[PDB]
Structures are given as structure tokens and as C-alpha cells.
Design a protein around this ligand. Sequence first.
Ligand SMILES: *CCC(=O)Nc1ccc(OC)c(Nc2cc(-c3[nH]c(CCCO)nc3-c3ccc(F)cc3)ccn2)c1
Length: 295
Amino acid sequence: GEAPNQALLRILKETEFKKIKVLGSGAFGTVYKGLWIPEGEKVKIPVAIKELPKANKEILDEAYVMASVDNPHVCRLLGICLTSTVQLITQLMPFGCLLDYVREHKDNIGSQYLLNWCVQIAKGMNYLEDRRLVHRDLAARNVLVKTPQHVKITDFGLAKLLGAEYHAEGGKVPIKWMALESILHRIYTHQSDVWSYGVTVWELMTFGSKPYDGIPASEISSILEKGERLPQPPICTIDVYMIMVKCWMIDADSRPKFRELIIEFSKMARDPQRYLVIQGDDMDDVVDADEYLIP
Ligand SMILES: *CCC(=O)Nc1ccc(OC)c(Nc2cc(-c3[nH]c(CCCO)nc3-c3ccc(F)cc3)ccn2)c1
């Protein structure tokens, strides 16, 4: 009913990290790659730096959330830099986001990886529920790939923190990943995130397809109320597709809880091809951020 948030917000000097290349702009703003070298700490840490005015209130809300999480399947904030622009520094995920990764390696992704990814995404999502945190923007584009065997959830710009059912007021929302009760009444729950988890899994099983492609977002409310959902992907058995359909039920409380999605996909992961049918199944002192722990 209280629980003080004793997370540490580290302030990083601009002379500590060396930007190396621009990763790309769009949606938000500039995202860099670089190395972060703490002064006299004999380490070099590959990092990603974000920036884009008084939008600083929005970027600092994301820094508040990113610094308040600690889970192997959720990207944590390493620190911020308060130079002429406000920078967000996090661990570099070298293989990009999962959406672009699954699109580029279509013909070389096995069932074991697809099922392992859903287990890990469900693990990070169940952790966010333990922190009473509603992501509100779960998608394949917001899942980054550290290694092909290790993914993490990112982008907390819309993440809201509950206590002991959030009502939104802002503008741009991703309609095609949102639960029905969020499109109509702007209600967001941990079960609202489960709906987005189902759409996220559907993205992976279709190897990067766009949900409701060619359908205007204004008609999504009409379609889902009539009982229509996303189609069964070709590679998915009815066992896998039944789980997707369960996350899209009207009653918010049937959508499996994230702890149950961990279990179901775990058991499918120990026999992957029974449930997915796929055709043909100075770099010296560099430390990964996951092995750099500060008290
Ligand atoms: C699919 C979009 C994408 O992010 N692609 C991508 C291409 C190349 C990369 O490195 C080789 C990475 N690594 C990475 C990215 C991010 C990051 N991505 C975004 C855009 C959201 C996509 O919808 N925002 C960030 C970011 C950066 C710094 C922060 F403090 C917080 C968030 C982070 C880490 N590694 C990705």
C-alpha cells in the first residue's frame, strides 16, 4: 500500500561515453550506438543513447520507469546525461528489435526460438505485473534482441504504475495492439497487456506480418465487436492458436495470466515441432551491461 521506490538514478558525465554511430531516427528521436567507459573503472560497456522543447517531461517519465525495473527480460536504464539535451543510456541490444529480426531471418528461424521468445516475453511481462506496472504498448517492435537466445522488453513511454484500471487522456495509441475495452473506454489493465501479448505472438508466428493489414484503424472497433480476430498463422497448430485466441476474449479475465502463459509455452518449448510446423526445421576490456553490477 506504500513501498518507497529506492531506485538509484545515476547521472553520467558526457566524457564517459564515446558515441560511435547513429542507429536511426523516427517515432521518437535520435538513437545512437556507443561505448560507455566509467572513469578509471577499466571497463568498456556497449550502450545505446536516446534523445530528441519541454518534451523532457515525457522522456524523464520513461527514465523513471526504466530505472525502477530489474529483470533479465526487461531493459533497465544505465543512467542519464544532463548536457544540452537529455540523453537516455541503456544496454545495447546488438541484433535489433525482434520485429525486424524475424522479418530479416524468415527462412532461418526454428520453432524452438519462436517458442523460447514467447516464454521470455511472458517472463518479463509477469515481472512487470509483480511491479504493478502496465506496459500499454507491448509489440514485436518493442522487444529487443540481445542475442538470438535472449530478448528483453523495452519502451516504457506509455508505461503506467498502479497501486492497491488506468484511464488515459493523451493522443497517439497503437489501436491494432490494444484490447477492446481500451479502444472504447480507455481502460488499461495487466489483462489489457495480455491482449497485446497475443498480437505480439501473432507477429512472430507470421514472421513479421502487419495485423489487420489494409484495415483502417477507425474500423478496428467495429471488427472486434463483431467477433472477428486475427487469423490462424500457417505454422501454428491449433494448440498454439488457441492460446492466441484466449488472449483476445471479451471478458478481460479469461485472457491467461502472464504466469500461465509462461507455463504453457514452456511445455511447448520442450517439444517445439509438435506445436509449430516450419519448413526445414580495441575489443579487449569490453563488458556487457548484464555483467556490470553497481551497489
Ligand atoms: C526495431 C527498431 C529498433 O530499435 N532497431 C534496432 C537496430 C540496430 C540496433 O543496434 C545495432 C538496436 N539496438 C538497441 C535499440 C534501443 C532502442 N530502440 C528504440 C526504438 C523503439 C522501437 O519501436 N529506442 C531505444 C532506446 C535507446 C536508449 C534508451 F535509454 C531507451 C530506449 C535500445 C538498446 N539497443 C535496435
